[PDB]
């Protein structure tokens, strides 16, 4: 009756816009749905610090868990790693609810241009690295395969998507430190870039710096690693 | 060393703006602070339903409780009832944290113009009535007295405020169905006025209808009363 909807897709792809549109159609069909995402909590702090991400994450999972007892939930978050998608499916699993992964995609050119339009809050170079490195959902686990893959440069038919999701809802549900280090070093890089307003060339060197640093680290303690990373950017 | 700051004041008075300014100055002083308010969760649903309010309230308090373990928290909410201020103080008392109530005020005319400015999302006559019936913090209980009273029609010295709060945070800490029905009947009224686009004369009828209704109810369980109120507005 209640379902968990898990969005996944890169920054600028249109997750927030899609969530809002999908929620409006669902509510028009008398479904009680809430849209929840990490940016809810993250943007409630006046500044970003790496040490906030743990509270942001858990607070987000908590609200989803609480919500999914009474309401459909649409999870509006990049969900860049399969371990994130697994953590969310485990919430549905806990309350025996169905779930549907909706993967939104657009070409890199489109994502960059949308980024430029939004005032390049994330550096273009970082979205480009994200796009190159993204493992498309379902590439490894059957439980990770999307219910819908949606091309956000093409027409999207919300009624159809609502219809399919509400059908799915009546079906029977059947069913990492490296990800942390990868994710937080990328966020630190982005903060540094925006904070120090780095020129294009410097942006490139810092993205490369991170790459080389992750090559070394792979060949660990998450905090020690991220602390060394900040120290590295400062030195550099 | 951590503190709960509880805002209180009518719609349009400048809570959310004040919160962002104060969080900025606190963070500039290396304080870890988060701004939380029931609208985070209320605005995450695509429409408003009365049945959501309990979830909203509880989810809000749970985020505050969780946050106050590690961060200063600024509570950005109307906090119209002293019962709401009591619940928030009790979270501070639970963790033995200092708290400060900050009462924000502005004249009715300024509230209306700001309301108009922003599109009259809450009917002006409802603002007027809230202004009329508002009980200023500390009217009855000593634990309810404002640490600070702020006139948002004048400039605000956030440096002084932060200094006063940091000083306060180093001190040793020392420590309802009628409200629900009052609150939700107002929200229902506001939502009918907007959804129905009532003319100004019908608005005043409906406002009076709520007043008359609340009289009769004082002479109960909240769900049934609220369903009847809606039935009354539909009839009327
Ligand atoms: N389907 C779409 N078609 C065209 N533009 C879109 C679409 N969805 C979102 N946008 C635009 O792309 C930008 C990023 O949208 P947003 O929903 O904020 O993406 P995300 O939440 O994935 O970061 C916004 O400017 C939005 O207006
Ligand atoms: N101190 C102030 N002086 C002038 N305008 C203000 C002040 N504080 C807020 N405003 C303006 O008043 C309107 C409502 O402010 P907001 O902070 O959203 O109030 P609240 O959160 O109390 O409803 C906004 O359009 C805002 O820009
Ligand atoms: Mg988004
Ligand atoms: Mg506000």
Curated annotation (Swiss-Prot), chains A, B:
Disulfide bond sites: none
Enzyme Commission number(s) from the entry: 2.7.1.164
Keywords: ATP-binding, Kinase, Nucleotide-binding, Transferase
Biological process per Gene Ontology, one example term: tRNA wobble uridine modification
The protein's role, per its UniProt record: Specifically phosphorylates seryl-tRNA(Sec) to O-phosphoseryl-tRNA(Sec), an activated intermediate for selenocysteine biosynthesis.
Family named by the database record: Belongs to the L-seryl-tRNA(Sec) kinase family.
Name of this chain's protein: L-seryl-tRNA(Sec) kinase
Organism per entry: Methanocaldococcus jannaschii (strain ATCC 43067 / DSM 2661 / JAL-1 / JCM 10045 / NBRC 100440) (Methanococcus jannaschii)
Lineage: Archaea, Methanobacteriati, Methanobacteriota, Methanomada group, Methanococci
The gene coding this protein: pstK
